[PDB]
Design a protein around this ligand. Structure first.
Ligand SMILES: CSc1cccc(CN2C[C@@H](C(N)=O)CCC2=O)c1
Ligand SMILES: [Zn+2]
Length: 139
């Protein structure tokens, strides 16, 4: 679990979105595993606007943050779940690091701000859904 709070918006993994998130829906993209809902309070998280490939993510299954090198956002094949059939997920970045399904939503940050949230991982892997291209989050 985990979410980004910026302005009048809440960014969550689409597969973890609640009934409240869907009744206050602003935008969703199944191919990215992202959903954005509107909120009654103002958020102060800062979204990074950069091409950083290094940062730190929160891993809830270890109660720890880990520094990682991560790939550029791209279409990567992801295996099936009760949430999705096997498919290409877009705007996804991989790093070598620990992750388990309940780790989805943990934030990845660089010196410029929030980069994305955990959404994948594998055998050692871990994947992050990028949010840096969502320029409208700031306005
Ligand atoms: C086996 S480690 C791991 C870590 C994070 C996530 C997963 C698998 N997964 C993929 C998600 C997606 N983005 O399609 C949907 C929900 C889900 O459980 C495995
Ligand atoms: Zn950066």
């Amino acid at each position: 679990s985990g979410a980004i709070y910026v302005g009048n918006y809440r960014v969550v993994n689409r597969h973890l979105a609640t009934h409240n998130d869907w009744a206050n829906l602003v935008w969703e993209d199944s191919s990215r595993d992202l959903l954005v809902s509107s909120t009654t309070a103002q958020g102060c998280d800062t979204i990074a606007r950069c091409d950083c490939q290094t940062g730190v993510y929160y891993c809830s299954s270890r109660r720890k943050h880990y520094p990682v090198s991560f790939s550029k956002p791209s279409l990567i094949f992801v295996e099936a779940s009760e949430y999705y059939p096997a498919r290409y997920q877009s705007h996804l970045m991989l790093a070598v690091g620990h992750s388990e399904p309940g780790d989805c939503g943990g934030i990845l940050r660089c010196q410029h701000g929030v980069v994305g949230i955990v959404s994948t991982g594998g055998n050692g892997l871990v994947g992050f859904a990028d949010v840096r291209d969502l320029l409208w989050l700031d306005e």
